[PDB]
Amino acid sequence: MEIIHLSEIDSTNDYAKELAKEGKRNFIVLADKQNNGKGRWGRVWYSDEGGLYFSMVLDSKLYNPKVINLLVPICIIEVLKNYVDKELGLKFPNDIMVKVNDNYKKLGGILTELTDDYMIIGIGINVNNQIRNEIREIAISLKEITGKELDKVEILSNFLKTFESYLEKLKNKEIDDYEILKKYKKYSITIGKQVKILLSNNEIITGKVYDIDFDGIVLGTEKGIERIPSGICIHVR
Numbered sequence: 001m002e003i004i005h006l007s008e009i010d011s012t013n014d015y016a017k018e019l020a021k022e023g024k025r026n027f028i029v030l031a032d033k034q035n036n037g038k039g040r041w042g043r044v045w046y047s048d049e050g051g052l053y054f055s056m057v058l059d060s061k062l063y064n065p066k067v068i069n070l071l072v073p074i075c076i077i078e079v080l081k082n083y084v085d086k087e088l089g090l091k092f093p094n095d096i097m098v099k100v101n102d103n104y105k106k107l108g109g110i111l112t113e114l115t116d117d118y119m120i121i122g123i124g125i126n127v128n129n130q131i132r133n134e135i136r137e138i139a140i141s142l143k144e145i146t147g148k149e150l151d152k153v154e155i156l157s158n159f160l161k162t163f164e165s166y167l168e169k170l171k172n173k174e175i176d177d178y179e180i181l182k183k184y185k186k187y188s189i190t191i192g193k194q195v196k197i198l199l200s201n202n203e204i205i206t207g208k209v210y211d212i213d214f215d216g217i218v219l220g221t222e223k224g225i226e227r228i229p230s231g232i233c234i235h236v237r
């Protein structure tokens with residue numbers, strides 16, 4: 001997979017999209033730092049030197065996008081496990097979390113955009129970048145956890161290798177789509193929790209998380225069982 005390695009850019013997602021609009025496919029845009037990194041729904045994503053910031057552009061018909069959406073977080077988890085001894089988990093939708101002192105802090109996130117012919121998967125992982133003092137309460141870096149500077153090159157390389165082997169096992173039919181979902185549920189720290197979810201239509205849904213599937217989250221609320229697509233969830237607390 002072709003990798004365009006930049007020293008800086010506004011956002012790897014936005015730049016990957018311009019290139020994708022013009023025809024490019026199956027490539028990655030990696031940037032040592034971002035001047036305007038973006039998170040889900042209007043969030044800013046601090047992208048100082050030391051972090052891993054890249055966007056993968058894939059053919060929309062390479063495989064089921066809904067399956068890919070679950071595969072990405074899974075691969076990140078399994079790759080980071082090789083570097084961290086602490087508990088890793090997935091917070092709905094795709095926050096990559098690490099347990100610290102009976103507390104979960106965010107190590108990274110995923111921002112995805114899907115079009116008819118391609119999907120852009122933006123991945124941000126806090127590796128050696130310094131987390132702003134204010135949010136050190138909810139965010140953390142791998143360097144803070146391990147006590148050592150990790151190699152961002154190796155991390156990316158292992159992520160890609162892991163992601164591709166899974167891709168080849170799915171198409172080769174060595175593993176079912178459901179097995180990917182089972183891995184997701186295994187790492188999910190959201191299922192079984194009582195939550196208040198803010199949606200993009202201003203509604204707030206409160207309830208017990210029974211399950212998360214390829215389409216979204218399933219909650220037991222006052223109204224009964226409610227299903228919510230992951231793409232419209234602005235905030236989950």
Ligand SMILES: O=C(O)CCCC[C@@H]1SC[C@@H]2NC(=O)N[C@@H]21
Nearest residue numbers: 011037038039040054109122124
């Ligand atoms: O947790 C989130 O809200 C999503 C964060 C996504 C961050 C990555 S960094 C690479 C890519 N470029 C961006 O501007 N955002 C994504």
